[PDB]
DNA sequence: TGTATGCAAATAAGG
DNA sequence: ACCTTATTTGCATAC
């Protein structure tokens, strides 16, 4: 419940800090621990309850788990360049085919699959801009 | 060097 | 497969 998250975020704080840890060293600590590993900033919004209440639930128990017993794919940088051509592309084609998302990924030299989501998700800032 | 944060990738859930 | 939708999560960078 409410209190209770309330709580735990800051004595973890402490304890965290006190075991001289860096928030970057707990993020990671967890990676050597459950496969994906959790960045500094994860760690800090978490600490300074910056974060929706049911990722603060979902996160709790990992740390809490982590605090006591210490006592994903990579984000893809999309360049200003492609991320122009894609726009491009997309003036022209707003829900391209397979083949042609593979076609591109091709031209522009990478994945595809970086590419199908870079168009789900303008699409999405399409709505946000033309209901 | 550690910590905060704005933007936007990536994801989970349900067709 | 692969979409929409809502949300989770990290890069990059200025305190």
């Given at each position: 419940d409410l209190e209770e998250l309330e709580q735990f975020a800051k004595t973890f704080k402490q304890r965290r800090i006190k075991l001289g840890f860096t928030q970057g060293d707990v993020g990671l600590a967890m990676g050597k621990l459950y496969g994906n590993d959790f960045s500094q900033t994860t760690i800090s919004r978490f600490e300074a309850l910056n974060l929706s209440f049911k990722n603060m639930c979902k996160l709790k128990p990992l740390l809490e788990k982590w605090l006591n017993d210490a006592e994903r794919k990579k984000r893809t940088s999309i360049e200003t360049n492609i991320r122009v051509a894609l726009e491009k592309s997309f003036l022209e084609?707003?829900?391209?085919?397979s083949e042609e998302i593979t076609m591109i990924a091709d031209q522009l030299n990478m994945e595809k699959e970086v590419i199908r989501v870079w168009f789900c998700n303008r699409r999405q800032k399409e709505k946000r801009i033309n209901p």
């Open positions: 084609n707003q829900k391209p085919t």
